[PDB]
Amino acid sequence: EFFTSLELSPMPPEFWEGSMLEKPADGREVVCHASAWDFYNRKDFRIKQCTRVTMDQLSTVHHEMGHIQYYLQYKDLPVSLRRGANPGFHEAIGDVLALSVSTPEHLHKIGLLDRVTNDTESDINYLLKMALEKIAFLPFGYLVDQWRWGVFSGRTPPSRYNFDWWYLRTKYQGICPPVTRNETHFDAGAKFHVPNVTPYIRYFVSFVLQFQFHEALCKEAGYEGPLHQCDIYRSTKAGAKLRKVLQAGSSRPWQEVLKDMVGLDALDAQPLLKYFQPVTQWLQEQNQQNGEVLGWPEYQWHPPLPDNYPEGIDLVTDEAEASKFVE
Amino acid sequence: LEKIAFLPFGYLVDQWRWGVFSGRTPPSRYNFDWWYLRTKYQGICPPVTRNETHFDAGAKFHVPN
Amino acid sequence: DPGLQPGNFSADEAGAQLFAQSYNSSAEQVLFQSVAASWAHDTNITAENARRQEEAALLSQEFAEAWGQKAKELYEPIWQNFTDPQLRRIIGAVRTLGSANLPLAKRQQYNALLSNMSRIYSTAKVCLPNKTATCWSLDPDLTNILASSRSYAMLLFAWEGWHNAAGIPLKPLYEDFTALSNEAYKQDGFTDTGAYWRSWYNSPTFEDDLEHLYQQLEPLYLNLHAFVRRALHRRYGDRYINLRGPIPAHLLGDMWAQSWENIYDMVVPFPDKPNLDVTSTMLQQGWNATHMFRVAE
Ligand SMILES: *[C@@H]1O[C@H](CO[C@@H]2O[C@@H](C)[C@@H](O)[C@@H](O)[C@@H]2O)[C@@H](O[C@@H]2O[C@H](CO)[C@@H](O[C@@H]3O[C@H](CO)[C@@H](O)[C@H](O)[C@@H]3O)[C@H](O)[C@H]2NC(C)=O)[C@H](O)[C@H]1NC(C)=O
Ligand SMILES: *[C@@H]1O[C@H](CO)[C@@H](O[C@@H]2O[C@H](CO)[C@@H](O)[C@H](O)[C@H]2NC(C)=O)[C@H](O)[C@H]1NC(C)=O
Ligand SMILES: *[C@@H]1O[C@H](CO)[C@@H](O[C@@H]2O[C@H](CO)[C@@H](O)[C@H](O)[C@H]2NC(C)=O)[C@H](O)[C@H]1NC(C)=O
Ligand SMILES: *[C@@H]1O[C@H](CO)[C@@H](O[C@@H]2O[C@H](CO)[C@@H](O)[C@H](O)[C@H]2NC(C)=O)[C@H](O)[C@H]1NC(C)=O
Ligand SMILES: *[C@@H]1O[C@H](CO)[C@@H](O[C@@H]2O[C@H](CO)[C@@H](O)[C@H](O)[C@H]2NC(C)=O)[C@H](O)[C@H]1NC(C)=O
Ligand SMILES: *[C@@H]1O[C@H](CO)[C@@H](O)[C@H](O)[C@H]1NC(C)=O
Ligand SMILES: *[C@@H]1O[C@H](CO)[C@@H](O)[C@H](O)[C@H]1NC(C)=O
């Protein structure tokens, strides 16, 4: 109904008779995955997911319903024009809508929350909670696909796998391995996307693109306020523009479509800069007050062995549990 | 031992200088990029610990001049 | 300066030849005075000579600026097409204004920065925590100790001392110089300073070809490194060097590991055969200064 409000997603009824949106009551079916498989057949689609009560599950449901919007929209195109333009679009369009749902204003105005908590402290809290997973991932993706490019193209011979991988980690993400590694180990294998053949820069491109989409839609939504609570709900023109963009799947270069929607044909982090503006200002004030270096004035620092010989790992060293035992 | 032991250094110094000029090396990865290049190409481990404060290229004459 | 300003030539062949000849004469004079100043800088007297070098460089750069501006405004539409390799090369050499694109204040700042870099590197010195009255320098003393001593502690002290004393007070100057050079060569027409430096060799696949060459030459250096690492492990023990791993920087021959020639003392294989030297000949027949040059003749 939120989709239909802005004349979007005239959902065909086959979903309410042949699509399973629930946990598997019987049979050893899929436990919990994160995909929205489409029936295709030129006619229909489906969802296969899990159902819970948490807000995270609701956000995931909105995310996969946004994925279903894409399919419902690009089916008149041929069988090879199914991937949506840039490969990172599917997450992006599937995520920007979630950015509208998670706002407390959306929950209150749709009836899930009693009233809007117009509090600066809550604003900063929520912004830092969400910026702990939409920013700490930004060096990643780029890191992984840069390393994979290096290994493929030949600049990283099999005698330099871990060296290049850990130099990249200490460069971009700035996290050093607690154990002194060497070239026998293959630390890139721990990630699931390295052994399986899966590109990983699509997620970085999406994490850059979704906020630009949010800013463009908000500018076309008529609400020139803060970017936090700027849901696309009840915006017929915004839905029409999103439908127009979604009409063509890979039929044109992604740069042209982005120029059509936002106004420029290249990626920009400026909407992302504006989105995290209050949390960035608060972070700058906190860093200045604490008096600490911004980052990486001393590298080649690897943590000492914590007595990691596997006999004392079970020893608990939590402050709260220690205080409770003391009392 | 006079020539081959030099070849990687010749390939290394100006690669680092290209990295610094082209912008891939901001003034916070001078020493880090230099010593990663040294450990990668020439197989040389700096003896003492080095932070970003040090500039381990001005020792070579061709870097300042 | 009458020769500073070029006349009103033409894009035609005769005008191009006249421009080339005028540049030849003017540059002959300019580099004559420049080489005179530079040579007098570093033979006997250094006082009032670095400043003379700076003013000579400034005037030569202004001369190059004027001539390059003239060459641009007189040959830019026809720079690519000249039907003569010599003309193309000379006009490309002249057109590269280089460090003249900066304004007067920026140009003075860049020249002062280069002079400061050179002087800071030249006068840098390192010595002991105590008895700090007189101490070493780079070439007369530091190279001798780092190439003749065989003590790990003293080698480390010399290496760390020189690297600190010549790198620490040099960082902000290098940052400013990189910014200025990038700006100047961006205004020149090249994407960056590194692109201009690569432009000398004139090959689009320069980096790829160099990487291929080094990948071809890698086994030689790997084997040599393994052998020298084993020798150094035998000499210094299994505490300051391991068989699987890199080699510490100072343990090698030169200061910056540029050449290992000074390590031949404890690397040479089969030492029973005598080393090759003709010092005994100098002991027999005197070689004061010219014998090694008459042999070149
Ligand atoms: C290039 O260097 C000159 C000369 O200064 C010398 O090199 C520097 C890198 C430092 O190591 C200096 O100690 C060394 O003498 C620099 O010109 C100098 O500028 C300063 C600032 O105007 C002049 O006065 C100094 O100012 C303060 C106190 O006001 C103190 O640092 C000093 O006590 C001194 O009084 C100094 O006289 C002047 N030297 C000259 C003109 O010969 C110049 O700034 C530098 N250029 C760049 C681009 O960095
Ligand atoms: C929540 O509080 C903020 C202030 O912390 C309100 O800020 C609004 O900001 C926009 C920016 O364009 C201004 O145009 C509005 O006038 C501001 N409103 C004010 C000052 O009352 C924001 O509107 C509040 N949100 C809700 C839903 O009440
Ligand atoms: C930078 O590395 C040096 C060693 O190369 C560290 O040691 C100090 O260096 C300073 C000069 O920066 C000397 O004055 C001190 O005597 C050194 N020792 C101690 C115990 O302080 C230095 O701490 C490192 N700095 C950073 C910021 O990482
Ligand atoms: C950590 O230490 C602080 C400060 O010592 C503890 O706070 C005090 O704990 C003692 C325990 O005997 C009490 O008598 C005091 O009244 C406490 N002061 C307070 C709460 O202001 C604290 O309990 C310790 N534990 C944690 C988890 O912080
Ligand atoms: C330096 O050595 C050269 C080469 O021997 C000397 O030049 C010759 O010295 C001999 C000494 O018996 C004379 O007979 C020759 O006439 C000299 N000239 C030539 C062309 O052979 C030279 O004198 C020595 N001293 C200096 C200061 O150059
Ligand atoms: C070149 O032309 C300028 C035009 O202002 C003139 O002033 C100058 O005298 C001319 N020079 C020669 C050498 O003819
Ligand atoms: C370049 O010069 C040659 C000289 O033979 C001429 O044939 C050619 O047309 C020129 N190209 C242009 C003017 O683009």
Residue numbers in the entry:
A (entry chain B): 299 to 625
B (entry chain A): 430 to 494
C (entry chain A): 2 to 298
Question: What did the published study say regarding this structure?
Answer:
Soluble human ACE (sACE), which includes the entire extracellular region of ACE, was expressed in HEK293F cells and purified from culture supernatant using an ion exchanger (Source Q) followed by size exclusion chromatography (Superdex S200). Ab initio reconstruction followed by heterogeneous refinement yielded a full sACE dimer map (214,893 particles), a map representing only the N/N dimer (268,471 particles), and 93,759 particles that mapped to an uninterpretable junk class. The remaining 88,930 particles mapped to a full-length sACE structure that was refined to 3.65 Å (sACE-3.65). Of these, ~268 K particles mapped to a dominant 2-domain class reconstructed as an sACE-N dimer, while ~21 K particles mapped to a minor 3-domain class containing two sACE-N and only one sACE-C, reminiscent of the recently published sACE cryo-EM structure. The remaining 89 K particles mapped to a full-length sACE dimer containing two sACE-N and two sACE-C, which was refined to 3.65 Å resolution. We refer to these ACE dimer structures by their resolutions, namely sACE-2.99, sACE-3.05, and sACE-3.15, along with the structure from data obtained using the Vitrobot, sACE-3.65. Based on the openness of the catalytic chamber, defined as the distance between the D1/3 a and D2/4 helices that gate access, we classified sACE-N into three conformational states: open (O), intermediate open (I), and closed (C); sACE-C is significantly less open than sACE-N in our structures and is only classified into intermediate (I) and closed (C) states. Our sACE-2.99 and sACE-3.65 structures are globally similar, both contain sACE-N domains in the open and intermediate states and sACE-C domains in the closed and intermediate states. As we observed substantial particle damage in our Vitrobot-prepared dataset, we thought it unwise to utilize that dataset for in-depth analysis and therefore, we focus on the larger and higher-resolution dataset collected at NCCAT below.
Angiotensin-I converting enzyme (ACE) is an M2 clan zinc metalloprotease (EC3.4.15.1) located on the plasma membrane and in the extracellular milieu. ACE plays a crucial role in the renin-angiotensin system by converting angiotensin I to the potent vasoconstrictor angiotensin II, and in the kinin-kallikrein system by degrading bradykinin, a potent vasodilator. ACE is a 180 kDa heavily N-linked glycosylated type 1 transmembrane protein with two homologous catalytic domains residing at the N- and C-terminal ends (ACE-N and ACE-C) in its extracellular region. Soluble ACE has two homologous catalytic domains: sACE-N (amino acids 1–615) and sACE-C (amino acids 616–1202).
